[PDB]
């Protein structure tokens, strides 16, 4: 992955650049779930 310090292709796990599984497990699930509820929409109409 990209390391800012190295400015290029470098082993990020060994570079100590680390993020929780949950931060990615939930990241994709929410996005993919949201898209599902955005694509349900086929019309907008203004209510009272």
């Amino acid at each position: 992955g990209i390391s800012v310090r190295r400015s290029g292709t470098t082993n990020t796990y060994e570079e100590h650049i680390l993020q929780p599984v949950l931060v990615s497990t939930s990241a994709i699930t929410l996005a993919s779930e949201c898209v599902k509820s955005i694509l349900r929409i086929d019309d907008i109409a203004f209510s009272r």
């Binding site: 699930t29 779930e33 949201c34 349900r40 086929d42 019309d43 209510s47």
Partner: protein
């Protein structure tokens, strides 16, 4: 010579019919996309508040959007009625409501037939569509084994059209378990629907027990094991007074100190009267004063404050306790008991989850999801499911959906027309034609040749294969019994009933008169 005041509108016969029709058809043609499996959702947004909602529930669309056309506002109400009387069938009611009126304009104009005569024909068809409904009804008897797998279907059918389509099997078992657990009770307050943001949609669950949106009485133990519960309504912070007007007139300050400690004694005694109950868990609708909150802590009794008439009533049903006041004679009133009350976390907020209760007669379903609208809808979708299934505990007969139900009536109404004859006959056939126009949109939203498919399914049901329905993923005629697409009789019986009434009310209309707005 003018008659009325100013800014008054008179739409007579010729034009009144236009409003009536154009108004209904407009409303019908608004929700048509909501109907069916491969159906789509609307995005409603108010000008006030900057709020919105992403919905399917046909009622929630119609009840929301403002309208001027009285004939439209008629169908709007009949949508609320259906949501009140059944919970599901909001959209079906309105579309069939409109399609009947669509087929009326086509008769009133293209054929020139008197509206009262279309009414006197629609009436003959409606009692015959409701007839062949009961004849085609599949009532499920003592076999609760056969009836459970029957109810689950009802949910699966109800849910596929909402976001919960992808997770049908999962949510069906959550609804079926919750209503069967409700032990016949037809009141939905007993199922608390707590929506908390985050995670997946598959992550929603029905708790084995109850989860309470409350906290413990302070520095008290976080998890009680082997609980025993007293449920209460009596006052605490307010300080119990004899209502009238007990004013203290102390001659000299000295007696005020005593009378101050007196109110403290009146409390200490009212907690000792409770202490005698021999109970480690005290839940009370009212607030627990900063003082009694401690008196319970020193004694070891866990005290929960603020769970209103709502919360208390469910706890009494799940723990098997009693909504108690007085507390003068502990022997006569019935305690509540459960296994463990440990305080869990759910994303952020701290909930006390009662687990392993004495009688499951009140439950809590926790919904999960990525968006506040997704949650909104899951609740609205779920209410539609906890309605059909709750009302089929009362009305235990079933009818095959997927357009089948409406087709079997289209059959009998169409053969009764070959029996009735006259100018009424045409309106009788039209009723049948309008019933057909429902499976038509079920097919139109999915995508296949509405003309071809409805025309293929007509042939079968008319040929006597009165199970045949629409396979709305495969675009074919498929057996509805063998594919488990079942619906409530009470649902379908209301749809036709409600709609037939809308029709006669409007078809009788010939003069729309509007007074100057306020």
């Amino acid at each position: 010579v003018q008659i009325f005041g100013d800014q008054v509108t008179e739409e007579r016969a010729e034009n009144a019919r236009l409003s009536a029709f154009v108004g209904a058809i407009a409303v019908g043609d608004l929700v048509k996309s909501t109907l069916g499996p491969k159906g789509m959702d609307k995005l409603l947004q108010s000008a006030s508040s900057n709020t919105c909602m992403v919905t399917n529930d046909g009622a929630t669309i119609l009840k929301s959007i403002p309208l001027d056309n009285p004939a439209a506002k008629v169908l709007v109400n009949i949508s609320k009625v259906q949501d009140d009387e059944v919970g599901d069938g909001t959209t079906s009611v309105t579309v069939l409501s409109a399609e009947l009126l669509r087929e009326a304009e086509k008769l009133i104009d293209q054929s020139k037939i008197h509206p009262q005569t279309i009414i006197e024909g629609y009436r003959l068809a409606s009692a015959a569509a409701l007839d062949a409904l009961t004849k085609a009804a599949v009532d499920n008897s003592h076999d609760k084994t056969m009836f459970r797998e029957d109810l689950i279907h009802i949910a699966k059918t109800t849910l596929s059209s909402k976001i919960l389509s992808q997770d049908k099997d999962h949510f069906a078992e959550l609804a079926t378990n919750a209503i069967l657990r409700l032990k016949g009770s037809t009141n939905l307050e007993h199922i608390q629907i707590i929506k908390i943001l985050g995670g997946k949609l598959s992550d929603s669950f029905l708790d084995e027990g109850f989860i309470l949106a409350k906290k413990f009485g302070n520095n008290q133990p976080k998890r009680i094991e082997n609980a025993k519960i007293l449920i209460a309504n009596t006052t605490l912070d307010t300080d119990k007074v004899k209502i009238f007007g007990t004013k203290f007139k102390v001659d000299s300050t000295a007696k005020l100190a005593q009378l101050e400690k007196a109110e403290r004694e009146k409390m200490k005694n009212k907690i000792a009267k409770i202490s005698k109950f021999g109970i480690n868990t005290f839940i009370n609708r009212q607030l627990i004063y900063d003082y009694p909150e401690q008196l319970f802590t020193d004694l070891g009794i866990n005290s929960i404050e603020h769970a209103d008439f709502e919360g208390v009533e469910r706890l009494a049903l799940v723990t098997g306790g009693e909504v108690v006041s007085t507390f003068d004679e502990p022997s006569k009133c019935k305690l509540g008991e459960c296994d463990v009350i440990e305080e869990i976390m759910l994303g952020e907020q701290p909930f006390l989850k009662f687990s392993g209760c004495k009688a499951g007669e009140a439950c809590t379903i926790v919904l999960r999801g990525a968006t506040d609208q997704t949650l909104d809808e899951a609740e609205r979708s779920l209410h539609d499911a906890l309605s059909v299934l709750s009302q089929t505990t009362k009305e235990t007969r079933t009818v095959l959906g997927g357009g089948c139900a409406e087709m079997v009536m289209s059959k009998a109404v169409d053969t009764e027309a070959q029996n009735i004859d006259g100018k009424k006959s045409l309106a009788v056939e039209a009723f049948a034609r309008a019933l057909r126009q429902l499976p038509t949109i079920l097919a139109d939203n999915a995508g296949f040749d509405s003309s071809e498919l409805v025309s293929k399914l007509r042939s079968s049901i008319y040929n006597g294969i009165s199970t045949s329905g629409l396979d709305l993923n495969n675009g074919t005629i498929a057996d509805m019994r063998q594919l488990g697409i079942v619906e409530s009789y009470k649902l379908k019986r209301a749809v036709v009933s409600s709609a037939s009434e809308a029709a006669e009310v409007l078809l009788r209309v010939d003069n729309i008169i509007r007074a100057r707005p306020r």
